[PDB]
Design an enzyme around this catalytic site. Structure first.
Site, PDB file in Angstrom:
ATOM      1  N   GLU A  15       0.722  -1.117   0.118  1.00 42.33           N
ATOM      2  CA  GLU A  15      -0.007   0.197   0.089  1.00 42.33           C
ATOM      3  C   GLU A  15       0.834   1.230   0.031  1.00 42.33           C
ATOM      4  OE1 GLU A  15      -4.386  -0.630   1.989  1.00 42.33           O
ATOM      5  OE2 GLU A  15      -2.598   0.327   3.275  1.00 42.33           O
ATOM      6  N   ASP A 118       4.484  -0.622 -16.703  1.00 39.04           N
ATOM      7  CA  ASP A 118       3.141  -0.414 -16.172  1.00 39.04           C
ATOM      8  C   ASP A 118       2.698   1.152 -16.159  1.00 39.04           C
ATOM      9  OD1 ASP A 118       0.655  -1.606 -15.510  1.00 39.04           O
ATOM     10  OD2 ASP A 118       0.940  -1.429 -13.301  1.00 39.04           O
TER      11      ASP A 118
END
Ligand SMILES: CN1CCN(c2ccc(OCc3ccccc3)c(C(=O)Nc3cccnc3)c2)CC1
Length: 259
Positions: A15, A118
């Site tokens: 996270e 990405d």
């Protein structure tokens, strides 16, 4: 010693959180990884290699148990994703500026032999003067070392941004793969929607594009000049796909639009 104030989103592993220093009120972003080690070793190593105006800054790292902490320059402008109005996109001059900065960041990473793997609006963030920064290097890897190119042999990324060859091929070149995803980001910016679920032979929207049905959405929302560049980027054959030096020579790319 820091206070996790709000959750920013999910990075590659774990996270990332807005954290503000107890002592100095410095606003910072932290990625928290509950400890793989080679992979964390790799990501950290690559982060320290990076120095460029369109790549996010790296600060440092600390471990508690098998928790690792990596701190980065907070992106005070938020994400590029938030500037894309759904179904509409954004004004053409704002998109061209963001594109110009993205290519600079991409040119930089390829010049040092790194591939991001990405590229998509959620990983493209903004500072206070709205300059774009490429974030998150958990999927990044080396494609060139001592002047010799390594092909990639592994699948990763996000299906609507991935090049077709990465789905069909045993091995493939890193550079054309980052170039594809940059065209899907330009598409998103100018139209506020993504062209297909995945660039696969069973995907009907991708078939529509191969046969040149540009009377359909999303292409019908894009001006003929940016469309003509997208024609050269979203090419199925990676060897015939336009490279970044040639993208720099494109008409729309060199069109004056913004004060
Ligand atoms: C007031 N504003 C609201 C918008 N603000 C905001 C919103 C989203 C962000 O990233 C989402 C994200 C992006 C990638 C992966 C997961 C999550 C970041 C940010 O700085 N993140 C970041 C920075 C450096 C490295 N990694 C992430 C900052 C900053 C404060």
């Amino acid at each position: 010693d820091w206070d996790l104030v709000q959750t920013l989103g999910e990075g590659a592993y774990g996270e990332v959180q807005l954290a503000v220093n107890r002592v100095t009120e410095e606003a910072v972003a932290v990625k928290i990884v509950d400890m793989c080690p080679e992979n964390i070793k790799k990501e950290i190593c690559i982060l320290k290699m990076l120095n460029h105006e369109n790549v996010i800054k790296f600060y440092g790292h600390r471990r508690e148990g098998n928790i690792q902490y990596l701190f980065m320059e907070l992106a005070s402008g938020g994400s590029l994703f938030d500037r894309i109005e759904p179904d509409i996109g954004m004004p053409e001059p704002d998109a061209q500026r963001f594109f110009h900065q993205l290519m600079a960041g991409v040119v930089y990473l390829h010049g040092i032999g790194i591939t991001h793997r990405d590229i998509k609006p959620h990983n493209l963030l903004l500072d206070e003067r709205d300059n774009l920064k490429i974030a998150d290097f958990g999927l990044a890897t080396v494609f060139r070392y001592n002047n010799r190119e390594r092909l990639l042999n592994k699948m990763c990324g996000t299906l609507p941004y991935v090049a077709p060859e990465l789905l069909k091929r045993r091995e493939f070149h890193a550079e054309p793969v980052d170039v594809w995803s940059c065209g899907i980001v330009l598409t998103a910016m100018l139209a506020g929607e993504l062209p297909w679920d995945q660039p696969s032979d069973s995907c009907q929207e991708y078939s529509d594009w191969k046969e040149k049905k540009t009377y359909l959405n999303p292409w019908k929302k894009i001006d003929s000049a940016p469309l003509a560049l997208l024609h050269k980027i979203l090419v199925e054959n990676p060897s015939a796909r336009i490279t970044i030096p040639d993208i720099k020579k494109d008409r729309w790319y060199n069109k004056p639009l913004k004060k």
